Write an enzyme that holds these catalytic residues in place. Sequence first.
Site, PDB file in Angstrom:
ATOM      1  CD  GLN A   1      44.588 -72.996-137.622  1.00 49.07           C
ATOM      2  OE1 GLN A   1      43.836 -73.316-138.658  1.00 49.07           O
ATOM      3  NE2 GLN A   1      45.659 -72.843-137.504  1.00 49.07           N
TER       4      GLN A   1
ATOM      5  CE1 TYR B   1      44.965 -88.058-144.042  1.00 51.73           C
ATOM      6  CE2 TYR B   1      46.568 -86.288-142.978  1.00 51.73           C
ATOM      7  CZ  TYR B   1      45.449 -87.253-142.792  1.00 51.73           C
ATOM      8  OH  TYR B   1      45.023 -87.336-141.568  1.00 51.73           O
TER       9      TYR B   1
ATOM     10  CG  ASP C   1      51.207 -65.201-144.054  1.00 49.74           C
ATOM     11  OD1 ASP C   1      51.066 -66.253-144.403  1.00 49.74           O
ATOM     12  OD2 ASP C   1      50.866 -63.972-144.287  1.00 49.74           O
TER      13      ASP C   1
ATOM     14  CG  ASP D   1      50.543 -80.307-145.304  1.00 56.38           C
ATOM     15  OD1 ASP D   1      49.321 -80.635-145.606  1.00 56.38           O
ATOM     16  OD2 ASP D   1      50.877 -81.064-144.186  1.00 56.38           O
TER      17      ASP D   1
ATOM     18  CE1 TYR E   1      38.050 -83.608-148.476  1.00 54.39           C
ATOM     19  CE2 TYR E   1      39.494 -84.094-146.848  1.00 54.39           C
ATOM     20  CZ  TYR E   1      39.175 -83.012-147.645  1.00 54.39           C
ATOM     21  OH  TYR E   1      39.718 -81.887-147.560  1.00 54.39           O
TER      22      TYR E   1
HETATM   23  C1  LIG Z   1      47.496 -79.043-140.118  1.00 49.07           C
HETATM   24  S1  LIG Z   1      48.200 -78.869-141.633  1.00 49.07           S
HETATM   25  C2  LIG Z   1      46.729 -79.789-142.571  1.00 49.07           C
HETATM   26  C3  LIG Z   1      46.845 -81.256-142.150  1.00 49.07           C
HETATM   27  C4  LIG Z   1      47.553 -82.241-143.006  1.00 49.07           C
HETATM   28  N1  LIG Z   1      48.932 -82.538-142.143  1.00 49.07           N
HETATM   29  C5  LIG Z   1      47.457 -77.151-142.060  1.00 49.07           C
HETATM   30  C6  LIG Z   1      48.275 -76.030-141.629  1.00 49.07           C
HETATM   31  O1  LIG Z   1      48.461 -75.005-142.238  1.00 49.07           O
HETATM   32  C7  LIG Z   1      48.659 -73.983-141.670  1.00 49.07           C
HETATM   33  N2  LIG Z   1      48.354 -72.641-142.213  1.00 49.07           N
HETATM   34  C8  LIG Z   1      47.271 -72.242-142.518  1.00 49.07           C
HETATM   35  N3  LIG Z   1      47.670 -70.973-143.221  1.00 49.07           N
HETATM   36  C9  LIG Z   1      48.792 -70.862-143.263  1.00 49.07           C
HETATM   37  C10 LIG Z   1      49.979 -69.778-143.735  1.00 49.07           C
HETATM   38  N4  LIG Z   1      49.389 -68.682-144.324  1.00 49.07           N
HETATM   39  N5  LIG Z   1      51.135 -69.955-143.707  1.00 49.07           N
HETATM   40  C11 LIG Z   1      51.482 -71.294-142.893  1.00 49.07           C
HETATM   41  N6  LIG Z   1      50.805 -72.272-142.588  1.00 49.07           N
HETATM   42  C12 LIG Z   1      49.634 -71.854-142.472  1.00 49.07           C
HETATM   43  C13 LIG Z   1      47.642 -74.020-140.565  1.00 49.07           C
HETATM   44  O2  LIG Z   1      48.008 -73.306-139.321  1.00 49.07           O
HETATM   45  C14 LIG Z   1      47.880 -75.588-140.101  1.00 49.07           C
HETATM   46  O3  LIG Z   1      48.620 -76.089-139.272  1.00 49.07           O
HETATM   47  C1  LIG Z   2      44.751 -82.762-145.899  1.00 43.03           C
HETATM   48  O1  LIG Z   2      44.827 -84.401-145.650  1.00 43.03           O
HETATM   49  C2  LIG Z   2      43.666 -84.816-145.116  1.00 43.03           C
HETATM   50  C3  LIG Z   2      43.096 -85.955-145.744  1.00 43.03           C
HETATM   51  C4  LIG Z   2      42.074 -86.314-145.219  1.00 43.03           C
HETATM   52  C5  LIG Z   2      41.340 -85.933-144.344  1.00 43.03           C
HETATM   53  N1  LIG Z   2      40.170 -86.701-143.801  1.00 43.03           N
HETATM   54  C6  LIG Z   2      39.204 -86.508-142.940  1.00 43.03           C
HETATM   55  C7  LIG Z   2      38.366 -85.066-143.096  1.00 43.03           C
HETATM   56  C8  LIG Z   2      37.539 -84.700-142.402  1.00 43.03           C
HETATM   57  N2  LIG Z   2      36.935 -85.633-141.285  1.00 43.03           N
HETATM   58  C9  LIG Z   2      37.470 -87.054-141.211  1.00 43.03           C
HETATM   59  C10 LIG Z   2      37.109 -87.481-140.128  1.00 43.03           C
HETATM   60  C11 LIG Z   2      37.534 -88.760-139.936  1.00 43.03           C
HETATM   61  C12 LIG Z   2      38.846 -89.309-140.866  1.00 43.03           C
HETATM   62  C13 LIG Z   2      39.174 -88.564-141.698  1.00 43.03           C
HETATM   63  C14 LIG Z   2      38.673 -87.152-142.030  1.00 43.03           C
HETATM   64  C15 LIG Z   2      41.885 -84.915-143.642  1.00 43.03           C
HETATM   65  C16 LIG Z   2      42.987 -84.227-144.054  1.00 43.03           C
END
Ligand SMILES: C[S@@H](CCCN)C[C@H]1O[C@@H](n2cnc3c(N)ncnc32)[C@H](O)[C@@H]1O
Ligand SMILES: COc1ccc(Nc2ccnc3ccccc23)cc1
Lengths: 279, 273
Positions: A36, A69, A145, A164, A225
């Site tokens: 990504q 979150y 994965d 998550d 959001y």
């Molecule tokens: C950053 S986290 C979202 C922000 C809230 N902590 C989203 C993570 O899910 C992962 N992701 C996406 N697809 C997968 C799979 N298939 N497996 C594991 N992790 C995954 C991706 O690399 C992000 O780091």
């Molecule tokens: C999955 O958990 C979360 C929960 C909430 C957000 N919020 C925001 C999304 C997009 N742009 C932003 C810009 C500024 C602040 C927050 C955001 C992201 C992940």
Amino acid sequence: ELISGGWFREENDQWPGQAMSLRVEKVLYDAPTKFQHLTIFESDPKGPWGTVMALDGCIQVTDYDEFVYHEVLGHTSLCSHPKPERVLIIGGGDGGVLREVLRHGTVEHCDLVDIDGEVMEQSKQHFPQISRSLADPRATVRVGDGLAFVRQTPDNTYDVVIIDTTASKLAFYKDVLRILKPDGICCNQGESIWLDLELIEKMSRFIRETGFASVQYALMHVPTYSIGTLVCSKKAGVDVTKPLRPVEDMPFAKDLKYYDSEMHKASFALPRFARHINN
Amino acid sequence: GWFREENDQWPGQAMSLRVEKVLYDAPTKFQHLTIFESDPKGPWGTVMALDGCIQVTDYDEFVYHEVLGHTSLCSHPKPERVLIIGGGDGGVLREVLRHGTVEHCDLVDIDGEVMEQSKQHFPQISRSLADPRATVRVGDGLAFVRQTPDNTYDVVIIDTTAFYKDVLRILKPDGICCNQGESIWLDLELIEKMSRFIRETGFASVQYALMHVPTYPCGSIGTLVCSKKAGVDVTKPLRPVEDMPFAKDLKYYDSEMHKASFALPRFARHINN
Ligand SMILES: C[S@@H](CCCN)C[C@H]1O[C@@H](n2cnc3c(N)ncnc32)[C@H](O)[C@@H]1O
Ligand SMILES: COc1ccc(Nc2ccnc3ccccc23)cc1
Ligand SMILES: C[S@@H](CCCN)C[C@H]1O[C@@H](n2cnc3c(N)ncnc32)[C@H](O)[C@@H]1O
Ligand SMILES: COc1ccc(Nc2ccnc3ccccc23)cc1
């Protein structure tokens, strides 16, 4: 491509004709990863946001709001379980959920599987207050994965599975149900009652029809959001909407910035147009 | 052709909507009034901004309108006479008028152009302005309450963009006051200061209710719900909406949502205790 003093712009296919923008004080990372686009920047120091992470152009973490979150996913799930000892996190490469999971004294081990090793590396570098958890000896952090990971997991391995994620396959839900022990709780990053109500309705029903006894959607208040979580119980007759093990009885309750038992209960109250999701 | 919204509270952040068609864009005697049709592929419909801040869209208007209207009226034992300050679009009034107990509602908005432009561009919001139970005045809310006798209203709703002592005074003993209450995100110090200012003017209690809006670049939106009478718990509905014939017409508000709205994130909890 992003530069310091420029603005980061976020647009959504579901909501065309709308854009959200942040001024970029300093670019910290901007490159394709194996999976990504990863963008990390320090936002305007006059604003509240601090460091901001985006994946494929969509903000996923900020210093200012991450506690929301993370606390919701970590505590609504664990406080719905009688004794969560073994926890799986799928995604959560930033470490936030894991930090919250590890506050619980009942957890002996937590596995974390994120597909993108660069997310975990960049979180160690630029979000130490979130990612410190990834070094904990009670954790095993794997790059892979989650789909394949749960497929190769034996039956009845986990007390709680937390999904998550951002991606799109997350057949999988049948594996999740299978790897859960009989008192098992699954929870997921659940999408918006505003953007994607039909998706939540669809997902809730396909999760129940997979064989989960109950599925309840929880809403959270983020500064910008909507974002929700589907909280699913393997065992029949569990009411996840009232905390099974209230956080107030645990020594860390007062370290939490968002979550408590009142918030837990309130989160399952949905605006009337969406209330049929939970009944 | 994009409408852009920024805030001094939130520097380095912007929210933008594409303009499909400008419907109104002029200074008024009191403020800048902007009405536009947004992207027809997006959900927002017609959008109104005042001094560059969005105040009403077709898509989300039900939220703030139902919350202000019902959280207050369902906290009153028998609301018969209602004042709305601001609310020139008619949204809160429409909600207030669903209640069968209401014999009369006065609405006072400073800007007559807002009501005129709402009649033209938001007919599903502003229909209420013509209701025989309503009397609509163009004037300043501050001067209006100053010239209102004691014990005139059961409920005062402040739906805006010394005064509070006048509000307390014009309320009957079981009076409820509620206002557009601002964001717990950063803006928290102001809510704390407002809640103390209101209790110290002589309201017996002040409780903040949070709402779930699809977008709010300014953080969040809430309402301070204030009771003139001591010992009233505005956090639990005194007259549940479910017992009234219009409960199923509502898109956001119910008793579950009423109760939930007063549960605040831990960091903001000290607002309500
Ligand atoms: C950053 S986290 C979202 C922000 C809230 N902590 C989203 C993570 O899910 C992962 N992701 C996406 N697809 C997968 C799979 N298939 N497996 C594991 N992790 C995954 C991706 O690399 C992000 O780091
Ligand atoms: C999955 O958990 C979360 C929960 C909430 C957000 N919020 C925001 C999304 C997009 N742009 C932003 C810009 C500024 C602040 C927050 C955001 C992201 C992940
Ligand atoms: C549109 S309503 C905004 C919330 C969406 N219902 C805000 C109204 O408050 C009016 N307003 C602002 N100040 C005052 C005073 N002092 N008095 C009356 N009305 C006022 C202003 O003209 C808007 O129409
Ligand atoms: C008085 O209560 C409210 C509650 C919510 C709004 N919403 C929006 C505010 C600002 N920018 C937006 C941009 C896009 C969509 C909605 C909005 C206004 C007034």
